[PDB]
Each structure stands twice: as structure tokens, then as C-alpha cells.
Amino acid sequence: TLQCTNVTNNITDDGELKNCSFNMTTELRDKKQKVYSLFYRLDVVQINSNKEYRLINCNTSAITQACPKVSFEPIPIHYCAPAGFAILKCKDKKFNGTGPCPSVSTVQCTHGIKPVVSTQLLLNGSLAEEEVMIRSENITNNAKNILVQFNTPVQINCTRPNNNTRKSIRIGPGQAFYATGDIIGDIRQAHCNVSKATWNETLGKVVKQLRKHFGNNTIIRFANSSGGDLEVTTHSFNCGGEFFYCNTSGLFNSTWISNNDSITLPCRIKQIINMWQRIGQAMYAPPIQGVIRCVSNITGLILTRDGGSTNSTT
Amino acid sequence: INSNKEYRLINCNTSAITQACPKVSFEPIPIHYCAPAGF
Amino acid sequence: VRPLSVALGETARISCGRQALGSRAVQWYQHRPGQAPILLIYNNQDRPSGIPERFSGTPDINFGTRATLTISGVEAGDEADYYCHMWDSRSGFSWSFGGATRLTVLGQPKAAPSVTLFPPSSEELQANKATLVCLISDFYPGAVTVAWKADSSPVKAGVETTTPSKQSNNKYAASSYLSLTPEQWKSHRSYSCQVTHEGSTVEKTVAPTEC
Amino acid sequence: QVQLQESGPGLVKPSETLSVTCSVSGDSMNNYYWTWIRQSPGKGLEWIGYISDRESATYNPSLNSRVVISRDTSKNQLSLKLNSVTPADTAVYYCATARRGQRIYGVVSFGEFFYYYSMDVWGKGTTVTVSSASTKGPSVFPLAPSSKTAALGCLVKDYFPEPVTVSWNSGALTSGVHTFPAVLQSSGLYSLSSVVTVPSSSLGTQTYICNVNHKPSNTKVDKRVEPKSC
Numbered sequence: 001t002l003q004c005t006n007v008t009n010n011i012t013d014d015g016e017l018k019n020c021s022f023n024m025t026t027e028l029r030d031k032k033q034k035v036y037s038l039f040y041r042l043d044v045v046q047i048n049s050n051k052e053y054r055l056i057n058c059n060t061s062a063i064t065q066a067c068p069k070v071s072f073e074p075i076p077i078h079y080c081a082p083a084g085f086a087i088l089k090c091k092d093k094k095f096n097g098t099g100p101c102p103s104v105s106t107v108q109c110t111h112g113i114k115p116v117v118s119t120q121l122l123l124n125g126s127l128a129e130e131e132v133m134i135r136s137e138n139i140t141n142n143a144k145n146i147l148v149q150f151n152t153p154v155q156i157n158c159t160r161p162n163n164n165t166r167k168s169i170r171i172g173p174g175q176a177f178y179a180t181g182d183i184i185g186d187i188r189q190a191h192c193n194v195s196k197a198t199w200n201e202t203l204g205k206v207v208k209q210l211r212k213h214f215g216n217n218t219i220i221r222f223a224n225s226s227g228g229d230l231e232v233t234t235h236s237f238n239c240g241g242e243f244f245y246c247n248t249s250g251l252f253n254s255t256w257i258s259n260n261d262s263i264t265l266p267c268r269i270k271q272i273i274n275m276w277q278r279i280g281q282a283m284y285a286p287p288i289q290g291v292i293r294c295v296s297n298i299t300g301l302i303l304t305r306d307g308g309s310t311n312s313t314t
Numbered sequence: 315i316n317s318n319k320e321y322r323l324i325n326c327n328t329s330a331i332t333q334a335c336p337k338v339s340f341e342p343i344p345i346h347y348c349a350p351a352g353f
Numbered sequence: 354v355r356p357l358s359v360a361l362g363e364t365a366r367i368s369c370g371r372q373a374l375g376s377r378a379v380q381w382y383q384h385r386p387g388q389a390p391i392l393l394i395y396n397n398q399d400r401p402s403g404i405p406e407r408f409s410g411t412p413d414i415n416f417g418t419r420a421t422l423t424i425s426g427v428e429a430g431d432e433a434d435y436y437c438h439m440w441d442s443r444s445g446f447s448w449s450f451g452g453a454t455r456l457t458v459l460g461q462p463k464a465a466p467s468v469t470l471f472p473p474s475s476e477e478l479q480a481n482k483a484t485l486v487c488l489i490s491d492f493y494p495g496a497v498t499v500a501w502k503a504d505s506s507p508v509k510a511g512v513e514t515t516t517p518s519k520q521s522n523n524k525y526a527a528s529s530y531l532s533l534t535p536e537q538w539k540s541h542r543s544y545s546c547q548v549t550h551e552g553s554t555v556e557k558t559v560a561p562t563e564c
Numbered sequence: 565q566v567q568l569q570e571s572g573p574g575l576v577k578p579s580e581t582l583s584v585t586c587s588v589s590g591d592s593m594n595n596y597y598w599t600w601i602r603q604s605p606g607k608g609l610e611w612i613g614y615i616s617d618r619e620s621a622t623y624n625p626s627l628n629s630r631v632v633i634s635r636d637t638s639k640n641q642l643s644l645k646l647n648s649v650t651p652a653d654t655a656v657y658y659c660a661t662a663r664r665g666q667r668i669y670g671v672v673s674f675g676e677f678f679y680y681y682s683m684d685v686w687g688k689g690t691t692v693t694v695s696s697a698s699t700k701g702p703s704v705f706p707l708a709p710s711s712k713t714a715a716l717g718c719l720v721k722d723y724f725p726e727p728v729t730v731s732w733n734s735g736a737l738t739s740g741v742h743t744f745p746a747v748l749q750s751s752g753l754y755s756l757s758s759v760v761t762v763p764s765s766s767l768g769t770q771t772y773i774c775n776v777n778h779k780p781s782n783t784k785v786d787k788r789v790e791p792k793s794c
């Protein structure tokens with residue numbers, strides 16, 4: 001049971017951070033602990049004097065914490081094959097991924113592949129060639145996901161501007177928990193910047209490629225997502241120690257037909273993570289001290305389509 | 315740790331403590347290290 | 354209030370009463386008794402037109418340095434109260450300017466008191482009231498004692514004495530009233546107001562027999 | 565050339581409506597923001613509230629909503645009213661303006677600035693005493709100079725409460741004026757004195773008119789000073 005408060009700020013709200021005082025335990029099994037920590041609203045939930053709160057995973061899955069030594073940083077991985085087998089690389093520039101491959105070359109290992117754990121956007125990966133390539137297993141099915149590959153990498157600067165403190169509290173022997181301390185100075189919130197100019201041109205170079213597969217002249221509209229878990233509806237990824245979840249809306253506010261500044265997106269951080277949904281086991285990501293910054297290069301995309309709506313309209 | 319003085323174990327603030335069960339002994343047993351074929 | 358004192362020609366620095374929370378806009382204010390306040394530092398270092406460059410506040414380097422004024426070439430006219438109004442990203446609206454640091458600049462030369470004694474007016478003596486008024490001015494420091502003498506003897510009866518208070522010259526001034534009647538005023542040969550400053554006395558004596 | 569002027573009542577009985585008016589001049593009233601501030605004897609500075617170009621007033625919650633503020637777009641006058649006054653409310657009041665600063669640290673779109681008010685233009689101020697004792701008119705007498713640079717003046721005696729203002733020749737005499745503090749008699753009444761300096765030879769040619777004004781008692785005395793008949 002967590003006794004928490006709306007975080008200290010001067011009004012002008014309508015929180016999400018809580019000063020949480022709770023009775024805890026120490027390394028000595030008899031004596032106990034009274035401590036405070038600051039938690040994001042997504043890791044807890046209240047229960048029904050001042051309101052009381054409890055963690056979100058308590059009624060689902062046993063929670064662990066990835067120890068701060070181990071990091072989450074994606075490291076390029078080359079998958080390799082043994083003798084009597086091999087790996088084949090399809091190098092032809094315009095390639096939709098299905099059917100026969102004109103350019104066939106064999107290797108014993110792939111290129112550097114960062115196993116980026118991320119959603120809605122792909123970072124640091126491989127770039128396409130010539131036109132931006134459109135790959136889908138079956139495009140007549142809206143349900144099947146469609147993947148794209150850039151010829152031009154896109155820059156993004158992701159930051160957690162808050163200057164965090166990590167409180168290491170002793171639950172041991174040998175156990176211990178790394179909590180979040182009070183922010184030092186200005187209260188800001190996470191965000192990532194993207195150039196609007198190359199963005200607008202990217203959608204123009206893309207919309208010319210869609211008009212080969214769909215219509216010679218038609219209408220193309222972008223809109224924000226539909227619904228689901230926060231790991232889908234928002235953009236998940238680890239930025240250096242921490243897992244960011246960002247609002248993507250204004251990127252996709254557009255309607256296209258035929259013929260200087262940048263953008264910014266809001267973001268949220270969540271520590272407790274069940275990712276890959278497997279129940280019975282959760283994980284907690286310890287907080288990282290201070291302002292977090294990670295720069296990413298966007299090499300890919302995943303999209304879905306709508307439905308019948310109106311015949312040959314949009 | 316600081317009536318009569320109170321005490322606590324030395325490992326409590328360091329490492330999770332186990333106990334080697336009394337069945338298992340510590341007695342050093344002569345060991346001959348060996349190598350496989352081709353070596 | 355927080356006492357502080359600096360010497361002449363030196364450099365003085367005044368810390369803020371509160372402490373910074375978030376990035377700050379530090380409003381430094383100054384106050385003199387009886388006068389109106391003056392803004393020196395707004396937006397933590399910024400200075401208006403007509404303010405001396407001897408005064409420098411603390412810039413915003415992202416926390417670190419607290420809010421502190423810096424006065425180079427301290428002068429005798431620098432004695433005043435000081436308020437640091439801390440506007441910042443966390444405490445929000447600041448309805449108080451903090452504490453009060455009253456600066457007193459020492460090192461000043463000594464003056465001699467200007468004393469004059471007055472008889473009751475021709476019209477006041479017609480009002481059945483006589484108030485002996487003894488005025489003192491231009492003395493550093495402000496330590497002065499006003500004593501009334503009936504002939505050669507001290508008068509504690511009906512002694513209304515004000516407090517020496519700073520003038521515009523950085524010296525004090527004090528008034529005193531002997532609460533009396535037109536009779537007692539004319540009853541003694543010479544009424545002497547004793548005003549003593551720094552061991553020396555400037556005494557003005559009014560005799561009713563002298564025009 | 566924006567300038568300001570106040571007006572006090574000068575005396576009020578406890579639990580009565582107190583009114584002060586600040587006159588705006590030199591500029592318009594819709595360009596900037598306005599404020600008032602008070603201080604009690606022995607205590608420190610206290611903020612009150614402010615009002616903006618759209619005329620909506622804002623107050624300090626420490627006042628229990630007993631304060632009301634109004635400007636006049638026509639008069640160029642900024643008014644004030646206070647009810648429910650107590651003996652501890654005797655104080656000195658001012659009026660000033662507020663430049664509205666916005667101190668930006670982070671992204672403005674997130675509200676990562678704040679609103680900091682830095683004060684620039686100020687005003688004079690008046691004095692009011694909250695007391696249950698009735699007002700007492702000042703006793704004005706023209707103290708006669710001596711014969712032997714000299715000194716003359718006028719007396720202000722047994723008046724309640726403060727302020728009492730004195731002037732010479734309806735404002736024709738300036739350099740050399742030294743006023744002295746007003747003692748507090750054991751009866752709760754004050755007395756003050758003022759003095760002006762001139763050259764030795766002005767006596768009898770230049771008429772010295774001491775103008776005494778006690779505004780709480782509305783006592784305006786034009787009394788003249790003349791040398792002794794000797």
C-alpha cells in the first residue's frame with residue numbers, strides 16, 4: 001500500500017508523478033523501513049483521509065527488476081549458419097520481399113542487426129535503395145501488416161529532460177532496490193524532435209511510390225492510431241536505461257491528393273514492463289540518474305489499412 | 315548495532331546467506347585432471 | 354531581519370533569503386526608510402536604464418550559484434533594507450520577497466550637532482501653553498541626549514523627547530519638548546537645553562529677558 | 565511620462581470602510597498592469613494583488629477576500645476599498661505598476677515558463693491611522709524669531725492622528741527646510757515642529773506664511789509668522 005501525493009508544482013495542470021511514502025523492509029528481517037519514492041502514474045493504481053495507491057502488476061505477475069549492471073542497449077547482432085547450410089542475401093534494389101529474387105548472394109552471417117525493442121518505429125537499422133520500397137505479404141488484406149524501408153535515414157533526438165536521482169534501498173542481503181529520487185531543478189517532461197521539412201518531403205516521396213501500386217492519381221490521408229495497449233497505441237523503446245512511450249499524432253495529421261522549423265512529440269516513461277505480454281513474470285526498469293538523451297536514425301515503418309468505407313474514395 | 319547490547323550477522327548488509335547442508339562435506343578429495351583424444 | 358555591515362570602497366554581496374527551485378527569475382528589490390522601493394535586478398541579472406553597473410546579480414547557469422547581488426565600490430549611501438524576490442519554476446507565485454537584510458555602511462567621519470532653542474511664540478503664550486522645543490541636526494553618529502535645565506538644575510518634569518533619526522545627509526536629527534506652562538517657562542532666569550554629542554555638548558540657552 | 569498620485573482619508577474608526585485612490589497620468593491605462601502594496605509599523609513588506617488589461621482582478625489569498633480593486637478607464641484613476649479595519653491595520657500604503665515577465669527555461673509549448681512580475685514604476689503614498697480616539701485639530705502658533713542666518717517657524721500641537729503637513733508662502737520657500745519628528749504624549753496626542761532657513765536681512769520685508777494642513781481633521785491654517793514686537 002502506497003501513500004502518494006500529487007507532485008509538487010504550482011497549479012496550472014488541467015501531476016502523474018507521486019511522492020509515495022510506504023512501509024518497507026530492510027536486510028535485517030525483523031526491523032523495517034519507511035521510505036519515499038517518486039513514481040510515474042502508469043506503474044501504479046489506486047485502491048478504494050488521503051488516497052492510497054498500489055502497483056499495477058500486483059494482481060497479475062511476479063515482478064522483478066533488471067539489475068542496473070545489465071543494460072537494455074540494442075547491440076548489433078549478426079545471425080550465422082553452420083556448415084552444410086548457408087544464408088542467402090537478396091540484394092536487388094527494388095524488391096517487394098515476395099516472389100523470386102533476381103539478385104542472390106550467399107553469406108554465412110547477416111549484417112549488424114541491433115535487436116531494437118521498439119514499436120511503431122524502427123531505429124538504427126538498414127536503409128533501402130533508389131525508391132522507398134513497399135513490402136507486404138498480401139496487400140489486399142488490411143489486417144496483414146505492411147513494412148517500408150527508407151533510402152534516406154531520418155534524425156530524431158529523444159530526451160528525458162528531468163534530472164533524476166536514484167535511491168538505492170537495501171532489501172537484502174544481496175538484494176536491493178533502486179528507486180527514483182526527487183527531480184533537481186526545473187520540472188520538464190520527455191519529448192523527441194523531428195525535422196518538419198525532410199518530413200514533408202518524405203511523405204511526398206512516399207506518396208509518389210504509393211501511386212505506382214494504388215491509382216495513378218488518388219487521395220491519401222494520415223490519421224492517428226485506433227486503440228490497444230499502450231505498447232501499441234504509443235511508441236515504445238529503451239532510451240539508454242529507460243523505456244519511453246510517446247504520443248504520435250501531429251506526424252499523421254495530413255490529407256494528400258496528387259499534385260523553416262521542426263516538430264516535437266510528447267513522451268512518457270514507464271518502469272514496470274511486461275513486454276511480450278507474458279504473464280506470471282513482469283520486469284522493472286531501474287531509473288537512470290539525470291537527463292537522458294539518445295539520438296536515433298529511423299530506417300523503417302509498420303502500417304495497417306482501413307476498410308471498405310466508400311468505393312474508390314480514400 | 316547501536317539495556318543490553320544487541321547484535322546482528324555480518325553478511326546481512328552484503329550478500330544473501332545460505333548454509334551448506336550437513337550431508338555435503340568440505341573434505342578435499344584427490345582429483346586427477348584428464349585430457350581428451352587429440353590432446 | 355538579517356543584520357549585515359560592509360566597509361567603504363570595498364565590494365559587498367547579498368545572498369537571497371530563499372533558495373532557488375527550478376530555473377529562476379530573481380527580482381532584487383531595495384528599500385530606504387520613508388522612500389519608495391527601487392528595482393535593481395530583474396530576470397536574475399537584468400538591469401534597467403539608469404542603474405549603476407556596480408550592481409550585478411546572479412545569472413542563470415542552471416542552478417549552482419544561489420541568487421546573490423554584487424556591489425563593487427561600497428559607499429556610505431548604501432545603507433538600506435534588501436529583498437530578493439525569487440520567481441522560479443517550482444515555488445511558482447511568490448507572494449513574499451523573502452527576509453530583510455538591512456545594510457549599515459560604517460566608516461564615516463564625525464560631525465557636530467547643530468542645536469537651537471526656541472521660546473514660546475507671542476501667539477502661543479496667548480494660548481496658555483508653553484512648549485520648549487530643542488532641535489538638533491547634522492551629527493554622525495546619532496547618539497544625542499536632550500536635557501532640560503531650569504536655571505542650573507535638571508528638569509525631568511514633562512520631558513517629551515523624540516528619537517534621533519537619519520536625515521537625508523546620512524546624519525541624524527532629534528527634537529525635544531519640555532511639557533510646561535507659560536508660567537514655568539518664564540519662572541527661571543535662563544532655560545538651557547543640553548544636547549550632548551560624542552562627549553561634547555552644544556547647549557542653547559533661552560532667557561526670557563533677552564529680545 | 566507616466567506618473568502617479570495617491571489620496572488618503574487619514575483617519576478611520578475600527579471596522580469601517582477605508583478608501584484610497586491612485587491617480588494615473590502621463591500614459592494610458594491599458595498598456596500595462598497595476599498593483600498596490602502596504603506595510604505595517606514594525607513588520608515587513610506584504611504583497612496584495614494585481615489587475616490586467618482585461619480588468620480582471622487577482623488577489624493574495626491571505627486577505628480573506630476582503631479586498632476589492634477597480635480602475636477607471638476615463639478618470640485615469642485607480643481606486644481601492646477596504647472594509648472591516650482593525651487597530652493593527654494602521655499602516656502606510658503605495659501604488660505601482662507591474663511589468664509582466666515570463667521566465668522561460670524549457671519548451672514554451674509545455675508551459676515550461678512561468679509568470680514573474682517585475683515592478684518598474686512606483687508612487688508616493690499616504691498614511692492612515694485606525695484608532696478609536698476622536699480626531700484632534702492641530703494647534704498652530706507662529707513661533708517668533710529672535711534678534712541677536714536665524715530661525716522662525718510655526719508649531720503644531722495636540723493633534724490626533726497624523727499626518728499634518730506644513731508649507732511656507734504657499735510654496736514660494738524651499739531651501740533650508742528641516743522638519744522634526746512628532747513626539748507621542750502620554751495622552752495619545754502628538755506635537756510637531758518645522759523650520760526654514762533664510763538670509764539674515766529678510767525679516768519684515770518677506771511675509772512668511774506657514775500653511776498647516778491636518779487632513780484627518782481637515783484643518784488648514786494659513787497662519788503668518790512675524791518677529792517679536794521688541
Ligand SMILES: *[C@@H]1O[C@H](CO[C@@H]2O[C@@H](C)[C@@H](O)[C@@H](O)[C@@H]2O)[C@@H](O[C@@H]2O[C@H](CO)[C@@H](O[C@@H]3O[C@H](CO[C@H]4O[C@H](CO)[C@@H](O)[C@H](O)[C@@H]4O[C@@H]4O[C@H](CO)[C@@H](O[C@@H]5O[C@H](CO)[C@H](O)[C@H](O)[C@H]5O)[C@H](O)[C@H]4NC(C)=O)[C@@H](O)[C@H](O[C@H]4O[C@H](CO)[C@@H](O)[C@H](O)[C@@H]4O[C@@H]4O[C@H](CO)[C@@H](O[C@@H]5O[C@H](CO)[C@H](O)[C@H](O)[C@H]5O)[C@H](O)[C@H]4NC(C)=O)[C@@H]3O)[C@H](O)[C@H]2NC(C)=O)[C@H](O)[C@H]1NC(C)=O
Nearest residue numbers: 001002003004020021022023024030031032033034035052
Ligand atoms: C506505516 O505504519 C504505521 C504503523 O506501523 C505499522 O505497524 C507496526 C506494528 C509495525 O509493523 C510497522 O512496521 C508498521 O508499518 C502507520 O501509522 C499508524 O496508522 C494507524 C492507522 O489507523 C493509526 O491508527 C490510529 O490510532 C488512533 C489512536 O490514537 C491515539 O494513539 C495513537 C497511538 O497510541 C497516537 O498515534 C494518536 O496520536 C493518539 O494518541 C494521542 O494523540 C494525541 C494527538 O496527537 C496526543 O495529544 C497530544 O498530547 C501532547 C502532550 O503529550 C500535546 O499536548 C499535543 O498538543 C497533543 O496533541 C495524545 O497525547 C496521544 N495519546 C497517547 C499517545 O497516548 C485511533 O484513534 C485511530 O482510530 C480512529 O479512527 C478509526 C478508523 O480509522 C476508528 O475505528 C477509531 O475508533 C478511531 O476513531 C475514534 O473513535 C473514538 C471512539 O471510539 C472517538 O472518540 C470520541 O471522541 C469524542 C470527541 O470527539 C468524545 O471524547 C468521545 O467520548 C470519544 O469516545 C474519536 O473521536 C474517533 N476519532 C476519529 C478521528 O474518528 C487509528 O486507529 C496509528 O496511530 C498510526 N501510528 C502509529 C501506530 O504509530 C503508517 O500510516 C504506515 N504508513 C503507510 C502504510 O504508508
Ligand SMILES: *[C@@H]1O[C@H](CO)[C@@H](O[C@@H]2O[C@H](CO)[C@@H](O[C@@H]3O[C@H](CO[C@H]4O[C@H](CO[C@H]5O[C@H](CO)[C@@H](O)[C@H](O)[C@@H]5O[C@H]5O[C@H](CO)[C@@H](O)[C@H](O)[C@@H]5O)[C@@H](O)[C@H](O[C@H]5O[C@H](CO)[C@@H](O)[C@H](O)[C@@H]5O)[C@@H]4O)[C@@H](O)[C@H](O[C@H]4O[C@H](CO)[C@@H](O)[C@H](O)[C@@H]4O[C@H]4O[C@H](CO)[C@@H](O)[C@H](O)[C@@H]4O[C@H]4O[C@H](CO)[C@@H](O)[C@H](O)[C@@H]4O)[C@@H]3O)[C@H](O)[C@H]2NC(C)=O)[C@H](O)[C@H]1NC(C)=O
Nearest residue numbers: 157193376396397398412413415665666668669670671672
Ligand atoms: C526540442 O525542441 C524543443 C522546442 O524547440 C526544445 O525546447 C527548447 O528548449 C530550450 C532549452 O534547451 C529552451 O531554451 C530557452 O529559451 C528561453 C527563452 O529564450 C528566448 O527569449 C529570451 C529572453 O529574451 C527576452 O527579451 C527578448 C528580446 O529582448 C524577447 O524576445 C523575449 O520575449 C524576452 O522578453 C523578456 O521581457 C519581456 C517584457 O517584460 C517579457 O514579456 C518576456 O517574458 C521576457 O521576460 C532570449 O534571451 C532568447 O534568446 C536565446 O535564444 C536565441 C535563439 O532562440 C539565441 O539566439 C540567443 O543567443 C539566446 O540563447 C530567446 O529569444 C531562454 O530564456 C532559456 O535560457 C535561460 O534559461 C536556461 C534554462 O534554465 C538557462 O540555462 C539559461 O542560462 C537562460 O537563463 C538566462 O537567460 C534568460 C533569458 O531570458 C534570463 O531570463 C535568465 O535570467 C538568464 O539570463 C542571465 O544570464 C544569461 C547567461 O546565463 C545572460 O545572457 C543574461 O543577460 C542574464 O545575465 C533557454 O534558452 C527553449 O525555449 C525551448 N523551446 C523552444 C521553442 O525553443 C528542446 O530543447 C529540443 N530538444 C532537443 C534535444 O533538440
Ligand SMILES: *[C@@H]1O[C@H](CO)[C@@H](O[C@@H]2O[C@H](CO)[C@@H](O[C@@H]3O[C@H](CO[C@H]4O[C@H](CO)[C@@H](O)[C@H](O)[C@@H]4O[C@@H]4O[C@H](CO)[C@@H](O)[C@H](O)[C@H]4NC(C)=O)[C@@H](O)[C@H](O[C@H]4O[C@H](CO)[C@@H](O)[C@H](O)[C@@H]4O[C@@H]4O[C@H](CO)[C@@H](O)[C@H](O)[C@H]4NC(C)=O)[C@@H]3O)[C@H](O)[C@H]2NC(C)=O)[C@H](O)[C@H]1NC(C)=O
Nearest residue numbers: 162163164165183184185288289290291415416417418419
Ligand atoms: C543534476 O543536476 C545537478 C545540478 O546541475 C548536477 O550536480 C551538480 O554538479 C555540480 C558540479 O558538477 C555542482 O556544482 C558545484 O559543485 C562544487 C563541488 O564539485 C567539485 O568537485 C566535483 C567532483 O565531485 C566536480 O565534479 C565539480 O566540477 C567541482 O570541481 C571543481 O569545479 C570548479 C569549476 O571551475 C573547478 O574550478 C575546480 O578546480 C574543480 N575542482 C576539482 C575538479 O577538484 C561545489 O563546491 C559548488 O558549491 C559551491 O558553489 C555553490 C553555488 O554554485 C554554492 O551554493 C556553495 O556554497 C559552494 O560555494 C563555494 O563555496 C566555497 C567555500 O565556501 C568557495 O570557495 C567557492 O568559491 C564557492 N563557489 C561558488 C560558485 O559560490 C557547486 O555545488 C552542483 O552543486 C551539483 N548539484 C547537485 C544538486 O548535486 C548533477 O550532475 C545532475 N545529474 C546528472 C546525472 O547530470
Ligand SMILES: *[C@@H]1O[C@H](CO)[C@@H](O[C@@H]2O[C@H](CO)[C@@H](O[C@@H]3O[C@H](CO[C@H]4O[C@H](CO[C@H]5O[C@H](CO)[C@@H](O)[C@H](O)[C@@H]5O)[C@@H](O)[C@H](O[C@H]5O[C@H](CO)[C@@H](O)[C@H](O)[C@@H]5O)[C@@H]4O)[C@@H](O)[C@H](O[C@H]4O[C@H](CO)[C@@H](O)[C@H](O)[C@@H]4O)[C@@H]3O)[C@H](O)[C@H]2NC(C)=O)[C@H](O)[C@H]1NC(C)=O
Nearest residue numbers: 223224225226227228232233234246247248249250252253
Ligand atoms: C487522435 O486525435 C484526436 C484529435 O487530436 C484526439 O483527441 C480528441 O480531440 C477532439 C478535438 O476536437 C476532442 O474534442 C471533441 O470536440 C468535438 C467538437 O466540438 C466542437 O464543435 C462543436 C460543434 O461542432 C459542429 O460541427 C461538427 C463538425 O461537423 C459536428 O460534429 C457537430 O455535431 C456540430 O455540428 C461545438 O458544439 C463544441 O463546443 C462549442 O459549443 C460549446 C457549448 O458548450 C461551447 O462551450 C464552445 O465554446 C463551442 O462554441 C466544439 O467547438 C466535440 O463534439 C467532442 O465531444 C463529443 O464527442 C466526444 C467523443 O465522442 C464525447 O466524449 C462528448 O461527450 C461529445 O459527445 C469533443 O469534445 C476529443 O475530446 C478528443 N478525444 C478525447 C478522448 O477526449 C485523440 O485522443 C487522438 N488519439 C490518439 C491515440 O492520439
Ligand SMILES: *[C@@H]1O[C@H](CO[C@@H]2O[C@@H](C)[C@@H](O)[C@@H](O)[C@@H]2O)[C@@H](O[C@@H]2O[C@H](CO)[C@@H](O[C@@H]3O[C@H](CO[C@H]4O[C@H](CO)[C@@H](O)[C@H](O)[C@@H]4O)[C@@H](O)[C@H](O[C@H]4O[C@H](CO)[C@@H](O)[C@H](O)[C@@H]4O)[C@@H]3O)[C@H](O)[C@H]2NC(C)=O)[C@H](O)[C@H]1NC(C)=O
Nearest residue numbers: 196221222223249250251252253254255256262263264673
Ligand atoms: C492539421 O493540424 C492543423 C493544426 O495544427 C496546428 O499546428 C501544429 C504545429 C500544432 O501546434 C497545433 O496545435 C496547431 O493547431 C489543423 O489546422 C487547424 O484547423 C483549425 C480548424 O479545424 C483552425 O482553426 C480555425 O478554423 C476556422 C474555421 O473553422 C470553422 O469551420 C470548421 C469546419 O470547417 C469547424 O469545425 C469549426 O468549428 C469552425 O466553425 C478558421 O476560420 C480559422 O482561420 C482564421 O484564423 C487562422 C489562424 O487561427 C488564420 O490563419 C486564417 O487566415 C483565419 O483568419 C482557423 O483556421 C486552425 O487555425 C488550423 N491551424 C493551422 C495552423 O492552420 C488542420 O486542420 C489539421 N489537418 C487535418 C486534416 O486535420
Ligand SMILES: *[C@@H]1O[C@H](CO)[C@@H](O[C@@H]2O[C@H](CO)[C@@H](O[C@@H]3O[C@H](CO[C@H]4O[C@H](CO)[C@@H](O)[C@H](O[C@H]5O[C@H](CO)[C@@H](O)[C@H](O)[C@@H]5O)[C@@H]4O)[C@@H](O)[C@H](O)[C@@H]3O)[C@H](O)[C@H]2NC(C)=O)[C@H](O)[C@H]1NC(C)=O
Nearest residue numbers: 112123124125126127152153154155156295296297298299
Ligand atoms: C544513422 O546511423 C547510420 C548507422 O549508424 C548511419 O548510416 C551509415 O553507417 C555506415 C556504417 O554503418 C557509414 O558507412 C561506412 O562506414 C564504414 C565503417 O566505418 C567504421 O569502421 C571504420 C573502419 O573500421 C572506421 O574507420 C570508422 O570510423 C570513422 O567514423 C568514426 C565515427 O563513427 C570516426 O571517429 C573515425 O575517425 C572515422 O571517420 C567506423 O568506425 C566506413 O569504413 C565507410 O567509410 C563508411 O563511412 C555511413 O557513413 C553512415 N551514413 C550514411 C549516410 O550512410 C546514418 O548516416 C545515420 N543517419 C543520420 C541521419 O545520422
Ligand SMILES: *[C@@H]1O[C@H](CO)[C@@H](O[C@@H]2O[C@H](CO)[C@@H](O[C@@H]3O[C@H](CO)[C@@H](O)[C@H](O)[C@@H]3O)[C@H](O)[C@H]2NC(C)=O)[C@H](O)[C@H]1NC(C)=O
Nearest residue numbers: 004005006007009011012013014015016017018041050051
Ligand atoms: C490531485 O489530487 C486531486 C484529489 O482530488 C485530484 O482532484 C480531482 O480532480 C478532478 C478533475 O479531474 C475533479 O473532478 C471535477 O469535479 C468538478 C466538480 O464536480 C467537475 O465540474 C469537473 O468536471 C470534474 O469532474 C475532482 O473533484 C478533484 N477532486 C476533488 C476532491 O475535488 C486531482 O485531479 C489530482 N491531480 C492529478 C494530476 O491527478
Ligand SMILES: *[C@@H]1O[C@H](CO)[C@@H](O[C@@H]2O[C@H](CO)[C@@H](O)[C@H](O)[C@H]2NC(C)=O)[C@H](O)[C@H]1NC(C)=O
Nearest residue numbers: 095096097098099100101102135136137138139
Ligand atoms: C512481388 O514481386 C513479384 C515480382 O518480382 C510479383 O510477381 C509475381 O511473381 C511470381 C513468380 O513467382 C508469379 O507467379 C506471380 O504471378 C507474379 N505476380 C505479379 C502480380 O506479377 C509478386 O506478385 C509481388 N508480390 C506482391 C505481394 O506484390
Ligand SMILES: *[C@@H]1O[C@H](CO)[C@@H](O[C@@H]2O[C@H](CO)[C@@H](O)[C@H](O)[C@H]2NC(C)=O)[C@H](O)[C@H]1NC(C)=O
Nearest residue numbers: 155156157158192193194195196262263293295
Ligand atoms: C539532433 O541533435 C543533434 C545534436 O545532438 C543535432 O545535430 C546538429 O545538426 C546541426 C545541423 O542541423 C549541425 O550544425 C550541428 O553541428 C549538429 N550538432 C551535433 C552535436 O551533431 C541535430 O540537428 C538535431 N536534430 C533535430 C531534428 O533536432
